[PDB]
């Protein structure tokens, strides 16, 4: 059996995005097959980028289980994803800050 996912070479569905784009489109939109492949590819790339950035810090602590703390460091650590995603990761905290004003007798 053939489908639209195996023709373009993408793991994201084509019908789901086409059905979801018809709700936000005003009146009766004509969302064909040329408007979903370009939309799902960006979402797949954005989803894979966070996973690839989080996988680089999971092998340093010697742990095979995926922890939610590694996803927050992959977003707040980079200067490109921190300015875009203005939300906060639930159950991750912040990045450790190092300063010279955390001792006795001032600095």
């Amino acid at each position: 059996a053939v489908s639209r996912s195996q023709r373009a070479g993408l793991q994201f569905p084509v019908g789901r995005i086409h059905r979801h784009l018809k709700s936000r489109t005003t009146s009766h939109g004509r969302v064909g097959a040329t408007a979903a492949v370009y939309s799902a590819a960006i979402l797949e790339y954005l989803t894979a980028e966070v996973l690839e950035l989080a996988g680089n810090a999971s092998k340093d602590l010697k742990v095979k289980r995926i922890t939610p703390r590694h996803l927050q460091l992959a977003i707040r650590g980079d200067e490109e994803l921190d300015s875009l995603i203005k939300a906060t990761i639930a159950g991750g905290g912040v990045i450790p800050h190092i300063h010279k004003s955390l001792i006795g007798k001032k600095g």
Binding site: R69, T88, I89, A90, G91, G92, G93, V94, P96, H99, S101, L102, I103, G104, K106
Partner: protein
Amino acid sequence: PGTVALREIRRYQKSTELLIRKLPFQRLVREIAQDFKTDLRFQSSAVMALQEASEAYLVALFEDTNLCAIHAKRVTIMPKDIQLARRIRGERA
């Protein structure tokens, strides 16, 4: 002294523990919810979802107050700086 409070920061920055209460924290919300409209109901996931956001909001509010003391050559936070920092975002007082 500064050796005891030095490791306490790293002990909290490496583990995301549940520092917010569950039973006494729900009564504070119920006391205000009962004043608007009576005969209400709540779940268990809503409290956790609110606590997960409050744990980040507290740190976000404390960072803005702690950053206003490095330039002024200070190490102790002051309640007067919170009102001045809240006016820039839009919450004010």
